Every structure is written in C-alpha cells, then in structure tokens.
Amino acid sequence: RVHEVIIFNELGEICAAVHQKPQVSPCCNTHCSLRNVAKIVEQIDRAVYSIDLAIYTFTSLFLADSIKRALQRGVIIRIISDGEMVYSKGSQISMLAQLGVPVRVPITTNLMHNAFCIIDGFERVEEIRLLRKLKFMRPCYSIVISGSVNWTALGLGGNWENCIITADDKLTATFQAEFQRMWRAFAKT
Amino acid sequence: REKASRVHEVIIFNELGEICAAVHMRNSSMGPCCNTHCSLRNVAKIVEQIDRAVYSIDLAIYTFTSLFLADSIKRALQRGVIIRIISDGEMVYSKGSQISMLAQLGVPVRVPITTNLMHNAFCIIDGFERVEEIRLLRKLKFMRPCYSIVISGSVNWTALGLGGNWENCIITADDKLTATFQAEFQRMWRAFAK
Ligand SMILES: [Zn+2]
Ligand SMILES: [Zn+2]
C-alpha cells in the first residue's frame, strides 16, 4: 500500500513552464509541488466512508474542492480546527460548514498545531457501519496524511513543508483515536 | 522481529498532557502515572532517541526554544556526535531561541536565503547515508553498530509540550522514511546559506 513522504521545497516551481483540479502534466522535477498536491488530493478522492480532518489553517482551494467532491459521494466528513484560525480570512471551513460539515474547536486558547487527516480510519468506519445499520461495507482501508502545520496549504507560499501519507495500521490507528478523543472533548461551532 | 521491535509510534501532545502534574509531585516528594497523554513521558521518549545517537543528528527545525532539548544535544556533542542544524531564517534570532548557544559550541547552522517559512520539523538520528558519509570522510573502515531513527511532526514538537499546545511527532526507525528525510536534509544543507 501507500507509505510515502511528500516534500515541498524551494524547487517546487522550477517546472512551472510545462504546466477536478489539479491535472498535472508530466515533468522531470522530482520536487514538483503540483505533483505533491495531486498525490494528496488523490487520497481524498479515494475516500469512501469517512474523512476526519484535524487542521490548523485550511486555505487551500484544491483541498476544499476535493473535500467537496467527497461529500457528494456520501463520505462523512468531520473537521477539527484551531480556534483562532477557524473562521479567519481565507479559511475554507465556513464554506464547508455551509454544506453540513460539522466543526469542533478547542476550548483552550492554545495553538492547535496537529494537522492530520484520517481517511476511512478503521475505528471510524466500523462506527459508521453500526450507526448506518449495516453488516457489509464496500472495500476500503485506512490512510493518514500527517506533517508540517501548513501541508494543508497545498504548496501555497512555496515554503518548506511536509506530510507523510501512510496506510500503516498503527499510525492510522493512533491518529484516528486522538481525533475521536478530541471530537468528544472539544466545543462545537 | 528484533527490527520490528524498534521504535515506531506517534507521540501526541494535547491538553491532557499535564493532568498528572500533582501525581508526579507527590511521587517526587517520595509518596509513574496513569496518564496515557503524559507530557513528561512524551519528552522522555523523544529525548531517549537523542541519547541513543552514535554518530549523527541532523536537525531541520523551524523553532528551537527548548532548553531541555538543547541540553540533550549538548550531551550528544560531548559524546562525539556530529550535530547539524537547518533553521528558519527569521526564527533563528527570536526570543528563547537556542541556536546561538549551540552554534557557539560549534554546531554548524544553516538557514535558507529567502524569508519563506522553514516549517520542516524533523530530526534524523544516525541516518544511514549520513553515517556512511561521516565514515568515508574520516577515512574509517567501519563504524560502531547503529540504526536510523527519524523524529518528525508538527511545527513545534520541539517545544516539548511546553506551552500545552497540540503538537505531534512520529518517531520511527522505518528504513524508507528515515532515508527519505535524511536525503532532503542533505539536499537543503547543500542548497542553503550560513
Ligand atoms: Zn512539475
Ligand atoms: Zn504523567
């Protein structure tokens, strides 16, 4: 399965001249930011039951659109955000909250820098199944995308960022558990 | 089996990190805690990896404020470990930043030229490529036993929970991940400025 480090750096745009968005034409730049973006979005496009998103700042249009498409397929999406940033200027979260996506934020003022996203997490999918009242689910498996606090900027700004995309059962288990924990303990908006 | 026994977990700092502070103080006065989110246990797991380093620690870091972390980097240095820092061009000067102190002890520090954000927060311990480079550079025919460990996560996992913010880092000896992080360190280090 997938187990990969996505790395944004200063070389991400050196191939700009050769360039359901994004549609990335082939290039020879191993550091292509567009390729990085397309890989992340792909994982979202592959969600079938659930997306749990703990995020610090959500300004990316490419990401918001993929979250939008997921909803239309009937993927159950929940967002956890930093309290200060949640409805700051540029935030896509309001838009998503308009479509029915629930959003929770911490009570405490501290920085919520845990930017990760669990797709079809095992514990979460089983949770849906029971509440959805089912026995058989369509086939899927857990993916976590996690890393630097602005990986969800999706290359926006040309910074040095990173996220790991992995199907590792232990890591995906831990992230999903913490989201469940934060979801129960945080406040709605 | 013994390799699969090696460190591979995610460490999470959250608001429950200091819930056990009184339990700890009662024990210290002479009278181990049950908190799964214990922030002290978190930092001990992190610092355990630093103390393990045999040859190299390559640190790509956004902000380095922790005294407790700078201390462990000091022990490694006195153990002979070769430490290198890549930092954010602006945060290197900020309040509480330990970069100057470490640099004065002879740690080489590099920053990017631009004012863009260096939001990488990773640490490679004895990355295979870097140990080989060190072996080749000192004309050695062998090295002591060791293995790659990388710590990587949210922008300020290096504050070590100080501040009680939500932070996280993967700590793993996973071969692919360590090699990938070490390679980006080598690239940046070559590309960057003193
Ligand atoms: Zn390209
Ligand atoms: Zn404790």
Swiss-Prot record, chain B:
Entry membrane topology: Single-pass membrane protein
Chief localisation class: mitochondrion
Effect of gene knockout: Defects in mid oogenesis. Females are viable but produce eggs with a range of dorso-ventral patterning defects. Flies lay few eggs, all of which are completely ventralized and often collapsed. Effects are due to defects in piRNA biogenesis and derepression of retrotransposons. Defects are not only present in germ cells but also in somatic cells of the ovary.
A GO BP annotation: primary piRNA processing
Subcellular location(s) per record: Mitochondrion outer membrane
Reported impact of residue 175 to E: In strain: =MEL01, MEL02, MEL11, MEL12, MEL14, MEL15, MEL16, MEL17, MEL18, MEL19, MEL20, ZBMEL82, ZBMEL95, ZBMEL131, ZBMEL145, ZBMEL157, ZBMEL186, ZBMEL191, ZBMEL229, ZBMEL377, ZBMEL384 and ZBMEL398
Active site per UniProt: 119, 121, 126
Segments on the Cytoplasmic side according to the record's topology features: 1-194
Keywords annotated in UniProt: Differentiation, Hydrolase, Lipid degradation, Lipid metabolism, Meiosis, Membrane, Mitochondrion, Mitochondrion outer membrane, Oogenesis, Transmembrane, Transmembrane helix
Subunit structure: Homodimer. Interacts with miga/CG12125.
Function (record text): Cardiolipin hydrolase present at the mitochondrial outer membrane required for piRNA metabolic process. Acts by catalyzing the hydrolysis of cardiolipin (diphosphatidylglycerol) to form phosphatidate (phosphatidic acid or PA) at the mitochondrial outer membrane surface, promoting the piRNA metabolic process. Plays a key role in primary biogenesis of piRNAs and is required during oogenesis to repress transposable elements and prevent their mobilization.
Protein family per UniProt: Belongs to the phospholipase D family. MitoPLD/Zucchini subfamily.
Protein name per Swiss-Prot or TrEMBL: Mitochondrial cardiolipin hydrolase
The organism's taxonomic lineage, starting at the top: Eukaryota, Metazoa, Ecdysozoa, Arthropoda, Hexapoda
The encoding gene: zuc
